[PDB]
């Protein structure tokens, strides 16, 4: 089960090192490209978004052709994923505990924004990126190691932005003042208000297209290193406000660095599983990855506009088991255990909760106790088979994570 190094992926070879933390299970998902699978719910959202840009977005010059990139390799450099987007070298979004690193220099993209700089650099004014993205996180019905994002970028020239106004040729895109909560230092408020208006009006119309003139949305001010001002859009769903996308006015240093210093732009990044789970009332993110026809056939529509009225699957009983152990001497991350659960338990596991931790005074070691909910999306799980999965996770935690079984 070692080496250890190398890792081979899509023909290329990645020497392992101190950053390397890809699990075999996660790599078996690379290439699957659910966003490209005809009649998959993620493919369906992608197509409806594409049609909206092609038919229903208007510009004064008028409206850009959005070139669509849904087949980019997820293997990116840390420069693509982080530095091109002005993300600081000490930013927590870079933590080994949160990202799948092939090694020091390469990784599975954590967001589709990892392609913004390159596509700008190629001179494109308007583009969509659709792709599988990869993040190390907890286990519950809303988190999965792979999910899918749709990115959009839209640049404006000065005369395009101000095209509707009389003395517009004296209005400008850029100035030299201060950054506020409302604008970057090199942007005029004249420009920012028009870009922000275009961004939100375009997203509101896309949501009305996807959902119907019924839904309740709200804009929440937030922060990203690569846009300013920035927002999340939240949809109220089952009584709770849920974020589905981040967006904002692109940081001018990013746009200038790619070679488009005569442009101002907006960008957004939407979570396809998050929206699909809301649009269709899909209760667990693991359903996107199952091949059960009770789920999948419901999204075979005659055309991408035939409304699908998702009928929820039966829920099957769960088996609950706890697992406690002594942490190794200062070398452990919660997300390592979560990776190992994914590896051994796979899609049998509905969630894992760290329920207890304490330090033992005589020994100085830390104990963790995790509660593991076993529940299959397609069938009832036998006590017998869960017992065997659980015992294997216990032994595996001892061999690989260096834990000491406390149970
Ligand atoms: N990349 C961000 C979303 C985003 C895209 C573009 C602009 C602003 C925000 C994320 O994954 O959360």
Numbering used by the authors: 9 to 415
Task: Please quote the paper that reports this structure.
Mutations in the mitochondrial aminoacyl‐tRNA synthetases (mtaaRSs) can cause profound clinical presentations, and have manifested as diseases with very selective tissue specificity. Among the recently reported pathogenic variants are point mutations in FARS2 gene, encoding the human mitochondrial PheRS. Patient symptoms range from spastic paraplegia to fatal infantile Alpers encephalopathy. How clinical manifestations of these mutations relate to the changes in three‐dimensional structures and kinetic characteristics remains unclear, although impaired aminoacylation has been proposed as possible etiology of diseases.
Here, we report four crystal structures of HsmtPheRS mutants, and extensive MD simulations for wild‐type and nine mutants to reveal the structural changes on dynamic trajectories of HsmtPheRS. Using steady‐state kinetic measurements of phenylalanine activation and tRNAPhe aminoacylation, we gained insight into the structural and kinetic effects of mitochondrial disease‐related mutations in FARS2 gene.
